[PDB]
Structure formats: structure tokens, C-alpha cells
Amino acid sequence: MNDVNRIRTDIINVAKTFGAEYSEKVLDEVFQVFGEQFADNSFMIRTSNKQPDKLGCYFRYHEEDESQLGLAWDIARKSGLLSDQGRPVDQLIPEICETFPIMADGVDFDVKHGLAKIWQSIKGVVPVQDAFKLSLPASVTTHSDFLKNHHLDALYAFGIDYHHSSVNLYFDTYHPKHHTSEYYKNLLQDLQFQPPSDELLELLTNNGEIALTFNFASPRIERLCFYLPFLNREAVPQNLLNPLLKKYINEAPALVDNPGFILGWSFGPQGGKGTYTKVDVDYHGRTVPL
Ligand SMILES: [Mg+2]
Ligand SMILES: [Mg+2]
């Protein structure tokens, strides 16, 4: 309705204000197909820190209505927003749906390049080894011992990245160690990843979500990400945010007066590529309170 145009307008305004590359033609094509899904579902607009002087911009939605599960992938394929090119990643969503009961799915979009990722949430958690029969990067299986040792073995969701041919695995933080700062410090050390600030370590004892990234091109775990919810702009730890991300916290568009946020901290190899911050506004006001 007005609601879809409202959302599309806000994304463009975000991209223009914060210096993100964007394509109106790609935004037009995405919204023609998924516009109503954005208005009717949990929906977030994300900016991130991947390059020092400009924020990238992404938008994503999460579908939990049982009757609609599977439609995102079917819609994406039939419309041509997602073509399978025989990539090892192109077979994973059908394998996942044939293997596990799915309780939610979602799609991530890049404002420049379009459909980027599809998520599938399992109905329950499974031992991660139950997933080893999927056509996942071989690095998932070869880290089975590491995943056990760090209690990253209660799997509940997959993220399938079609732009980068990578897979994110999301793990339930079930263990008493997941409530200690030492666990996160030790986890990043063991991975030889960039060390976290003491401020972040203290926040991470709230546990949040953890995701690990595996790529078909690499024998190594590529990246990991910690996610924490925040009930409003004032709750966000602003000392952890560069000036552009601080401006985003104070100006991100939403349909409530004081939206919540989900921040993600991505970590990669020490002195390498994958350490940066993601900030997602709870556009409708319904995502974070849950
Ligand atoms: Mg829905
Ligand atoms: Mg958790």
C-alpha cells in the first residue's frame, strides 16, 4: 500500500544519507516481488562498517507464518531474483527443507546487488553433526571437534549467502560458559581472530546469538558474528560505534517513535578482512521485543 512505498522510500533515504552504493532498478525489482512481505512481516534495515568511510545498506525480513514457509525461495526463483547457477550453495535450501522441519525463513537484500541470502530456522535445535549430510563446506565437518569443544553444537538456523558462496550456522548458547566473558575471549583467541574490546566482552555475557561462517573456497572458518538486541536507541553502546553508525542509531527510519536495534559484531582473522559492525533497526517495532 502506502506501507510498501513508505518502506522503499526509507531505504533509499538511508542509502543516500549514509553513502551506500545503491541501484534504484534493483530496488524496484526487489520491491515488485517482495514489497508486501516487507510490510507484513518482521523487517529490519541494516547498515554496516565493512569499509571505513561508507556504510553498506541491507534490508531483510523474517517470515514465521506456517502457511507462507517456502514461498520466499519459490518467489525468489520464479521471479528471477535468484537463479541457480549450479553453485554448491544453490542446492542447500532444498536439501535443508527435505532434512529438517522449518519454522521460519527469511531473505536478505543488498541495496546495490539485490537478493543476497536466504535463512532457514529449524523447528527446534539439532546436534550440528545432524547437518553433516548436507552439501555444506567441507570445513564444517573438519571443525566438528572444535564445534564440540566450544559448545557450538546446538544448531538451529542456516544462512545461505548467494553473493559469497558461504553458509552461516547459528548456534544456541546453551552452556554456562556462554554467560562468561572468558569464553568469548578464548573463542576468538583460538580462532586467531581479532581480539574484542573489554566493553564488548562484558556485553557478550548477555549471550545473544552466535553465528559462524564457512566458505566453499576455504578450509578455515571464515568469520564469526555475535548478535545482541537493544530495546531502544538509548540502550545501544555508543562507544562501540564509529560516527556514521552513531548517526544511524539516532536517525534510522522506523514506524515507531523509539525502535529497538540488533547489533552484530563480525570477527575475522587478526589483521585480515572480516571484523566490523552491523546495526539493524527494528522497523516495525515487533522484532526486538520478542
Ligand atoms: Mg508473516
Ligand atoms: Mg542465545
GROMACS .gro file of N, CA and C in nm, residues 118-257:
model
  420
  118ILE      N    1   1.936  -1.629   0.195
  118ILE     CA    2   1.812  -1.687   0.246
  118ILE      C    3   1.843  -1.763   0.375
  119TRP      N    4   1.763  -1.738   0.480
  119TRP     CA    5   1.775  -1.807   0.609
  119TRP      C    6   1.664  -1.910   0.623
  120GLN      N    7   1.697  -2.020   0.690
  120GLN     CA    8   1.602  -2.122   0.732
  120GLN      C    9   1.626  -2.148   0.880
  121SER      N   10   1.520  -2.139   0.961
  121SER     CA   11   1.524  -2.167   1.104
  121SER      C   12   1.460  -2.303   1.130
  122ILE      N   13   1.532  -2.390   1.198
  122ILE     CA   14   1.482  -2.524   1.228
  122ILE      C   15   1.379  -2.514   1.340
  123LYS      N   16   1.281  -2.604   1.337
  123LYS     CA   17   1.183  -2.614   1.444
  123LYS      C   18   1.247  -2.699   1.554
  124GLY      N   19   1.313  -2.632   1.649
  124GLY     CA   20   1.396  -2.696   1.750
  124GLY      C   21   1.544  -2.678   1.718
  125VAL      N   22   1.629  -2.729   1.808
  125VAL     CA   23   1.773  -2.733   1.781
  125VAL      C   24   1.809  -2.879   1.756
  126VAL      N   25   1.911  -2.899   1.674
  126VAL     CA   26   1.963  -3.032   1.645
  126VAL      C   27   2.112  -3.034   1.677
  127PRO      N   28   2.169  -3.148   1.716
  127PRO     CA   29   2.315  -3.161   1.716
  127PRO      C   30   2.369  -3.122   1.578
  128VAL      N   31   2.474  -3.040   1.576
  128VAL     CA   32   2.525  -2.989   1.450
  128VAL      C   33   2.566  -3.103   1.356
  129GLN      N   34   2.611  -3.217   1.410
  129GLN     CA   35   2.651  -3.327   1.322
  129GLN      C   36   2.535  -3.380   1.239
  130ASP      N   37   2.411  -3.356   1.281
  130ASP     CA   38   2.296  -3.394   1.200
  130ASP      C   39   2.296  -3.323   1.066
  131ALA      N   40   2.367  -3.211   1.057
  131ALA     CA   41   2.374  -3.131   0.935
  131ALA      C   42   2.487  -3.175   0.843
  132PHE      N   43   2.574  -3.265   0.888
  132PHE     CA   44   2.692  -3.300   0.810
  132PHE      C   45   2.656  -3.374   0.682
  133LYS      N   46   2.536  -3.431   0.672
  133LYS     CA   47   2.497  -3.496   0.547
  133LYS      C   48   2.456  -3.397   0.439
  134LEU      N   49   2.437  -3.270   0.473
  134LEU     CA   50   2.409  -3.168   0.373
  134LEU      C   51   2.535  -3.139   0.292
  135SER      N   52   2.516  -3.075   0.176
  135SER     CA   53   2.629  -3.034   0.092
  135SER      C   54   2.691  -2.903   0.143
  136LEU      N   55   2.731  -2.905   0.270
  136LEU     CA   56   2.792  -2.789   0.334
  136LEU      C   57   2.940  -2.781   0.297
  137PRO      N   58   3.004  -2.665   0.317
  137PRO     CA   59   3.150  -2.661   0.301
  137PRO      C   60   3.213  -2.772   0.383
  138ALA      N   61   3.314  -2.838   0.325
  138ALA     CA   62   3.386  -2.942   0.397
  138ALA      C   63   3.443  -2.892   0.529
  139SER      N   64   3.467  -2.761   0.540
  139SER     CA   65   3.518  -2.705   0.665
  139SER      C   66   3.420  -2.719   0.780
  140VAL      N   67   3.291  -2.742   0.755
  140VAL     CA   68   3.201  -2.768   0.868
  140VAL      C   69   3.239  -2.900   0.935
  141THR      N   70   3.247  -3.007   0.856
  141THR     CA   71   3.282  -3.137   0.913
  141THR      C   72   3.422  -3.137   0.975
  142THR      N   73   3.520  -3.077   0.907
  142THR     CA   74   3.656  -3.083   0.962
  142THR      C   75   3.673  -3.001   1.089
  143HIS      N   76   3.574  -2.919   1.126
  143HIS     CA   77   3.576  -2.850   1.255
  143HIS      C   78   3.479  -2.911   1.356
  144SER      N   79   3.433  -3.035   1.333
  144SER     CA   80   3.337  -3.096   1.425
  144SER      C   81   3.393  -3.103   1.567
  145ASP      N   82   3.523  -3.132   1.580
  145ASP     CA   83   3.583  -3.136   1.714
  145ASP      C   84   3.583  -2.997   1.777
  146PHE      N   85   3.625  -2.896   1.701
  146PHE     CA   86   3.627  -2.760   1.753
  146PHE      C   87   3.487  -2.715   1.795
  147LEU      N   88   3.386  -2.746   1.713
  147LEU     CA   89   3.250  -2.706   1.746
  147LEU      C   90   3.205  -2.769   1.878
  148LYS      N   91   3.239  -2.897   1.898
  148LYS     CA   92   3.211  -2.963   2.025
  148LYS      C   93   3.283  -2.895   2.141
  149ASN      N   94   3.413  -2.869   2.124
  149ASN     CA   95   3.495  -2.817   2.234
  149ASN      C   96   3.448  -2.679   2.280
  150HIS      N   97   3.389  -2.600   2.191
  150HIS     CA   98   3.342  -2.466   2.227
  150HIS      C   99   3.190  -2.459   2.241
  151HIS      N  100   3.124  -2.574   2.248
  151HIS     CA  101   2.979  -2.582   2.266
  151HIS      C  102   2.905  -2.499   2.160
  152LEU      N  103   2.954  -2.504   2.037
  152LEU     CA  104   2.883  -2.452   1.921
  152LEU      C  105   2.829  -2.569   1.842
  153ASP      N  106   2.746  -2.651   1.908
  153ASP     CA  107   2.700  -2.776   1.850
  153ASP      C  108   2.549  -2.794   1.862
  154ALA      N  109   2.477  -2.693   1.911
  154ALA     CA  110   2.330  -2.696   1.913
  154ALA      C  111   2.282  -2.606   1.800
  155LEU      N  112   2.263  -2.665   1.683
  155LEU     CA  113   2.235  -2.588   1.562
  155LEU      C  114   2.087  -2.557   1.552
  156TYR      N  115   2.053  -2.432   1.516
  156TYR     CA  116   1.912  -2.402   1.495
  156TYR      C  117   1.878  -2.325   1.367
  157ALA      N  118   1.975  -2.273   1.293
  157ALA     CA  119   1.940  -2.196   1.174
  157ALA      C  120   2.055  -2.199   1.075
  158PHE      N  121   2.020  -2.189   0.946
  158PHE     CA  122   2.115  -2.174   0.836
  158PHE      C  123   2.095  -2.040   0.766
  159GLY      N  124   2.206  -1.975   0.731
  159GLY     CA  125   2.205  -1.862   0.639
  159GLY      C  126   2.286  -1.900   0.515
  160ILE      N  127   2.224  -1.889   0.399
  160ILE     CA  128   2.284  -1.930   0.273
  160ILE      C  129   2.313  -1.803   0.194
  161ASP      N  130   2.442  -1.767   0.180
  161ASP     CA  131   2.483  -1.644   0.112
  161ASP      C  132   2.516  -1.675  -0.033
  162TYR      N  133   2.431  -1.626  -0.125
  162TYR     CA  134   2.449  -1.650  -0.268
  162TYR      C  135   2.547  -1.554  -0.333
  163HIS      N  136   2.574  -1.439  -0.272
  163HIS     CA  137   2.672  -1.348  -0.329
  163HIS      C  138   2.814  -1.395  -0.300
  164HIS      N  139   2.836  -1.463  -0.188
  164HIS     CA  140   2.970  -1.502  -0.146
  164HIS      C  141   2.992  -1.652  -0.141
  165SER      N  142   2.893  -1.734  -0.178
  165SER     CA  143   2.900  -1.880  -0.169
  165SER      C  144   2.949  -1.924  -0.032
  166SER      N  145   2.882  -1.876   0.071
  166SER     CA  146   2.916  -1.912   0.207
  166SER      C  147   2.788  -1.949   0.279
  167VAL      N  148   2.805  -2.014   0.394
  167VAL     CA  149   2.695  -2.059   0.479
  167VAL      C  150   2.723  -2.012   0.621
  168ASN      N  151   2.623  -1.951   0.684
  168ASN     CA  152   2.630  -1.921   0.827
  168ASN      C  153   2.555  -2.027   0.905
  169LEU      N  154   2.615  -2.077   1.013
  169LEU     CA  155   2.544  -2.166   1.104
  169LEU      C  156   2.519  -2.091   1.234
  170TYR      N  157   2.395  -2.094   1.283
  170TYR     CA  158   2.357  -2.024   1.405
  170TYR      C  159   2.339  -2.125   1.518
  171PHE      N  160   2.398  -2.096   1.633
  171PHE     CA  161   2.405  -2.192   1.743
  171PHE      C  162   2.339  -2.137   1.868
  172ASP      N  163   2.264  -2.225   1.933
  172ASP     CA  164   2.201  -2.197   2.060
  172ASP      C  165   2.306  -2.194   2.171
  173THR      N  166   2.307  -2.086   2.249
  173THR     CA  167   2.404  -2.068   2.357
  173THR      C  168   2.354  -2.135   2.485
  174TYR      N  169   2.367  -2.268   2.490
  174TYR     CA  170   2.305  -2.347   2.596
  174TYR      C  171   2.391  -2.363   2.721
  175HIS      N  172   2.520  -2.335   2.713
  175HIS     CA  173   2.616  -2.384   2.812
  175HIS      C  174   2.646  -2.276   2.916
  176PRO      N  175   2.671  -2.307   3.043
  176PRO     CA  176   2.710  -2.199   3.136
  176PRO      C  177   2.828  -2.114   3.089
  177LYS      N  178   2.921  -2.171   3.011
  177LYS     CA  179   3.034  -2.091   2.961
  177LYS      C  180   2.987  -1.977   2.870
  178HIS      N  181   2.872  -1.992   2.803
  178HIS     CA  182   2.825  -1.887   2.713
  178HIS      C  183   2.782  -1.760   2.787
  179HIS      N  184   2.778  -1.764   2.919
  179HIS     CA  185   2.747  -1.647   3.000
  179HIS      C  186   2.870  -1.586   3.065
  180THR      N  187   2.990  -1.624   3.020
  180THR     CA  188   3.114  -1.573   3.078
  180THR      C  189   3.192  -1.499   2.971
  181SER      N  190   3.257  -1.389   3.009
  181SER     CA  191   3.334  -1.315   2.910
  181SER      C  192   3.455  -1.395   2.864
  182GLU      N  193   3.514  -1.475   2.953
  182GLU     CA  194   3.632  -1.553   2.920
  182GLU      C  195   3.606  -1.647   2.803
  183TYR      N  196   3.484  -1.699   2.793
  183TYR     CA  197   3.453  -1.789   2.683
  183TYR      C  198   3.469  -1.720   2.548
  184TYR      N  199   3.418  -1.598   2.535
  184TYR     CA  200   3.426  -1.528   2.406
  184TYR      C  201   3.568  -1.484   2.376
  185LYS      N  202   3.641  -1.438   2.478
  185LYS     CA  203   3.781  -1.403   2.460
  185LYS      C  204   3.859  -1.525   2.413
  186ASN      N  205   3.839  -1.639   2.479
  186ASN     CA  206   3.911  -1.761   2.444
  186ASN      C  207   3.871  -1.812   2.306
  187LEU      N  208   3.744  -1.797   2.270
  187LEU     CA  209   3.698  -1.843   2.139
  187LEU      C  210   3.766  -1.766   2.027
  188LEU      N  211   3.773  -1.634   2.041
  188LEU     CA  212   3.838  -1.552   1.939
  188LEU      C  213   3.988  -1.577   1.935
  189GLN      N  214   4.051  -1.597   2.051
  189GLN     CA  215   4.194  -1.630   2.053
  189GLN      C  216   4.222  -1.759   1.979
  190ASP      N  217   4.145  -1.865   2.011
  190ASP     CA  218   4.163  -1.996   1.947
  190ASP      C  219   4.145  -1.989   1.796
  191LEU      N  220   4.058  -1.902   1.748
  191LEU     CA  221   4.042  -1.885   1.604
  191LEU      C  222   4.149  -1.797   1.542
  192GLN      N  223   4.239  -1.740   1.623
  192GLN     CA  224   4.334  -1.639   1.574
  192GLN      C  225   4.260  -1.520   1.512
  193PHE      N  226   4.147  -1.484   1.569
  193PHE     CA  227   4.071  -1.370   1.521
  193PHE      C  228   4.106  -1.245   1.601
  194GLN      N  229   4.066  -1.129   1.547
  194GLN     CA  230   4.090  -1.001   1.613
  194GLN      C  231   4.034  -1.002   1.755
  195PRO      N  232   4.110  -0.956   1.855
  195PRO     CA  233   4.059  -0.959   1.993
  195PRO      C  234   3.948  -0.857   2.011
  196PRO      N  235   3.851  -0.886   2.098
  196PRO     CA  236   3.744  -0.790   2.125
  196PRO      C  237   3.782  -0.694   2.237
  197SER      N  238   3.720  -0.576   2.234
  197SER     CA  239   3.738  -0.482   2.343
  197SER      C  240   3.679  -0.538   2.473
  198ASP      N  241   3.728  -0.486   2.585
  198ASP     CA  242   3.671  -0.526   2.713
  198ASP      C  243   3.525  -0.484   2.725
  199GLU      N  244   3.488  -0.369   2.668
  199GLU     CA  245   3.348  -0.328   2.669
  199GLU      C  246   3.259  -0.432   2.601
  200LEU      N  247   3.300  -0.481   2.484
  200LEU     CA  248   3.220  -0.582   2.416
  200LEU      C  249   3.215  -0.712   2.496
  201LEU      N  250   3.328  -0.753   2.553
  201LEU     CA  251   3.331  -0.878   2.630
  201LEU      C  252   3.226  -0.877   2.741
  202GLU      N  253   3.214  -0.765   2.812
  202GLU     CA  254   3.114  -0.757   2.918
  202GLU      C  255   2.973  -0.769   2.861
  203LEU      N  256   2.946  -0.700   2.750
  203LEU     CA  257   2.814  -0.711   2.687
  203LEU      C  258   2.786  -0.854   2.643
  204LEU      N  259   2.888  -0.927   2.601
  204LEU     CA  260   2.862  -1.057   2.541
  204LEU      C  261   2.816  -1.160   2.644
  205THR      N  262   2.834  -1.132   2.773
  205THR     CA  263   2.785  -1.220   2.877
  205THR      C  264   2.632  -1.225   2.883
  206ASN      N  265   2.563  -1.131   2.817
  206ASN     CA  266   2.419  -1.144   2.793
  206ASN      C  267   2.387  -1.255   2.694
  207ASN      N  268   2.491  -1.317   2.635
  207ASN     CA  269   2.491  -1.436   2.550
  207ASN      C  270   2.450  -1.404   2.405
  208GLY      N  271   2.330  -1.349   2.383
  208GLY     CA  272   2.288  -1.320   2.246
  208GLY      C  273   2.294  -1.443   2.155
  209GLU      N  274   2.311  -1.418   2.025
  209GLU     CA  275   2.325  -1.523   1.926
  209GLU      C  276   2.469  -1.529   1.876
  210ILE      N  277   2.508  -1.647   1.828
  210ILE     CA  278   2.640  -1.669   1.769
  210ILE      C  279   2.619  -1.736   1.634
  211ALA      N  280   2.692  -1.690   1.534
  211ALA     CA  281   2.692  -1.750   1.401
  211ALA      C  282   2.835  -1.765   1.355
  212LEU      N  283   2.864  -1.876   1.289
  212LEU     CA  284   2.995  -1.899   1.228
  212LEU      C  285   2.977  -1.907   1.077
  213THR      N  286   3.075  -1.858   1.002
  213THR     CA  287   3.066  -1.855   0.857
  213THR      C  288   3.167  -1.951   0.797
  214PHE      N  289   3.121  -2.035   0.706
  214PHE     CA  290   3.204  -2.133   0.636
  214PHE      C  291   3.193  -2.104   0.488
  215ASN      N  292   3.304  -2.115   0.415
  215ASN     CA  293   3.305  -2.087   0.272
  215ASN      C  294   3.350  -2.212   0.198
  216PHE      N  295   3.294  -2.231   0.079
  216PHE     CA  296   3.336  -2.340  -0.008
  216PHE      C  297   3.476  -2.321  -0.063
  217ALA      N  298   3.530  -2.199  -0.057
  217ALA     CA  299   3.663  -2.173  -0.111
  217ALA      C  300   3.775  -2.191  -0.009
  218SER      N  301   3.743  -2.214   0.118
  218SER     CA  302   3.845  -2.209   0.222
  218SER      C  303   3.832  -2.324   0.321
  219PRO      N  304   3.945  -2.383   0.361
  219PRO     CA  305   3.940  -2.485   0.467
  219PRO      C  306   3.921  -2.428   0.606
  220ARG      N  307   3.921  -2.296   0.622
  220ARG     CA  308   3.918  -2.231   0.752
  220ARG      C  309   3.780  -2.174   0.782
  221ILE      N  310   3.745  -2.169   0.910
  221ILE     CA  311   3.630  -2.087   0.949
  221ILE      C  312   3.661  -1.943   0.910
  222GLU      N  313   3.570  -1.882   0.833
  222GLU     CA  314   3.599  -1.752   0.771
  222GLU      C  315   3.572  -1.637   0.867
  223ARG      N  316   3.468  -1.648   0.946
  223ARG     CA  317   3.419  -1.535   1.022
  223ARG      C  318   3.331  -1.589   1.131
  224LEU      N  319   3.315  -1.510   1.235
  224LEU     CA  320   3.209  -1.536   1.330
  224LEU      C  321   3.137  -1.406   1.364
  225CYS      N  322   3.014  -1.417   1.415
  225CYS     CA  323   2.939  -1.297   1.447
  225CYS      C  324   2.863  -1.318   1.577
  226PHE      N  325   2.866  -1.216   1.662
  226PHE     CA  326   2.788  -1.209   1.785
  226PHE      C  327   2.676  -1.108   1.765
  227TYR      N  328   2.555  -1.141   1.812
  227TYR     CA  329   2.439  -1.054   1.796
  227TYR      C  330   2.376  -1.025   1.931
  228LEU      N  331   2.344  -0.898   1.958
  228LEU     CA  332   2.277  -0.858   2.081
  228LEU      C  333   2.160  -0.765   2.052
  229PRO      N  334   2.044  -0.786   2.115
  229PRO     CA  335   1.932  -0.692   2.100
  229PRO      C  336   1.943  -0.576   2.197
  230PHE      N  337   1.880  -0.465   2.159
  230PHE     CA  338   1.878  -0.345   2.240
  230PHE      C  339   1.741  -0.283   2.226
  231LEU      N  340   1.679  -0.249   2.340
  231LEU     CA  341   1.538  -0.214   2.338
  231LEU      C  342   1.511  -0.078   2.275
  232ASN      N  343   1.609   0.011   2.270
  232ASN     CA  344   1.586   0.142   2.212
  232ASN      C  345   1.720   0.205   2.178
  233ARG      N  346   1.713   0.323   2.114
  233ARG     CA  347   1.835   0.393   2.074
  233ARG      C  348   1.924   0.421   2.194
  234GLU      N  349   1.863   0.453   2.309
  234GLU     CA  350   1.939   0.492   2.427
  234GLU      C  351   2.014   0.375   2.490
  235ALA      N  352   1.969   0.252   2.467
  235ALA     CA  353   2.034   0.135   2.525
  235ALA      C  354   2.158   0.092   2.449
  236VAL      N  355   2.182   0.147   2.331
  236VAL     CA  356   2.288   0.097   2.243
  236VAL      C  357   2.423   0.147   2.295
  237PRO      N  358   2.525   0.060   2.302
  237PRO     CA  359   2.656   0.105   2.349
  237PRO      C  360   2.728   0.191   2.245
  238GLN      N  361   2.709   0.322   2.255
  238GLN     CA  362   2.754   0.413   2.152
  238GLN      C  363   2.906   0.423   2.142
  239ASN      N  364   2.980   0.392   2.250
  239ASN     CA  365   3.126   0.395   2.243
  239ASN      C  366   3.182   0.289   2.149
  240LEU      N  367   3.104   0.188   2.114
  240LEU     CA  368   3.148   0.084   2.022
  240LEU      C  369   3.118   0.120   1.877
  241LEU      N  370   3.063   0.238   1.850
  241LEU     CA  371   3.016   0.273   1.717
  241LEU      C  372   3.095   0.391   1.663
  242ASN      N  373   3.138   0.381   1.537
  242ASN     CA  374   3.203   0.494   1.470
  242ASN      C  375   3.100   0.605   1.448
  243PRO      N  376   3.144   0.725   1.409
  243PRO     CA  377   3.047   0.835   1.394
  243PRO      C  378   2.931   0.805   1.300
  244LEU      N  379   2.954   0.739   1.186
  244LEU     CA  380   2.843   0.713   1.095
  244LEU      C  381   2.741   0.619   1.157
  245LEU      N  382   2.787   0.516   1.227
  245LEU     CA  383   2.694   0.422   1.289
  245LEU      C  384   2.620   0.487   1.406
  246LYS      N  385   2.684   0.582   1.475
  246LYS     CA  386   2.613   0.658   1.579
  246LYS      C  387   2.502   0.742   1.518
  247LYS      N  388   2.530   0.806   1.405
  247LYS     CA  389   2.426   0.881   1.335
  247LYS      C  390   2.313   0.787   1.292
  248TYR      N  391   2.346   0.665   1.251
  248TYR     CA  392   2.242   0.571   1.210
  248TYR      C  393   2.150   0.536   1.326
  249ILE      N  394   2.208   0.510   1.444
  249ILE     CA  395   2.129   0.483   1.564
  249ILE      C  396   2.029   0.595   1.589
  250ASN      N  397   2.071   0.720   1.571
  250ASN     CA  398   1.984   0.832   1.604
  250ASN      C  399   1.889   0.869   1.491
  251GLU      N  400   1.912   0.822   1.368
  251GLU     CA  401   1.831   0.866   1.256
  251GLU      C  402   1.769   0.754   1.174
  252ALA      N  403   1.794   0.628   1.208
  252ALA     CA  404   1.738   0.518   1.131
  252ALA      C  405   1.587   0.531   1.125
  253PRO      N  406   1.525   0.508   1.009
  253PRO     CA  407   1.380   0.522   1.000
  253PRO      C  408   1.312   0.398   1.055
  254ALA      N  409   1.192   0.420   1.109
  254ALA     CA  410   1.113   0.313   1.168
  254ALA      C  411   0.970   0.361   1.172
  255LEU      N  412   0.879   0.270   1.206
  255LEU     CA  413   0.739   0.307   1.219
  255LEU      C  414   0.696   0.318   1.365
  256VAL      N  415   0.791   0.322   1.458
  256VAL     CA  416   0.766   0.356   1.597
  256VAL      C  417   0.857   0.471   1.635
  257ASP      N  418   0.821   0.539   1.745
  257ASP     CA  419   0.897   0.657   1.785
  257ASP      C  420   1.038   0.620   1.829
   0.00000   0.00000   0.00000
